[PDB]
């Protein structure tokens, strides 16, 4: 069953050497992880590559009032 | 008797009158010492009253 064996590993080696990527996917595995990741995307957020966020907050205006007692 | 004339007593009797309003005028009611102790309760209470405005 060995013989029978590294016949698999001929096939991996083949299966290897790519210059177009997915030769039996087509458009169909093309359309549907390009669709599945923009509809989780979607489902993530909308975050760029490299843009580092900083912002800043506003604290609560400290009133006071009056009250007449002696 | 039925006596007669009456230039007498009745001279006599508004002279009496200057005697028995000097002693009766000195006389004392019970009643106004009752009185005294009102204003002293009230004036007190808003003095407290202007001390607790003096707090508040």
Known sequence: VQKLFVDKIREY???????GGPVDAGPEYQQDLDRELFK???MYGKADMNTFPN???????????????? | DTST???????MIMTLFILFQLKISNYSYPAS????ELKTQKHST????KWTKIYL
């Not at chain 2, 010492?33 to 005294?36: A, C, F, T, V």
């Open chain 1, 13 to 19: 080696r083949t299966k290897r050497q790519t210059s």
């Open chain 1, 40 to 42: 989780l995307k979607q």
């Open chain 1, 55 to 70: 912002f800043t907050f506003e604290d609560p205006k400290f009133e006071a009032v009056e009250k007449p007692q002696s």
């Open chain 2, 5 to 11: 004339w009456f230039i007498t007593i009745t001279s």
């Open chain 2, 33 to 36: 010492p009752e009185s005294i």
């Open chain 2, 46 to 49: 808003p003095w407290e009253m």
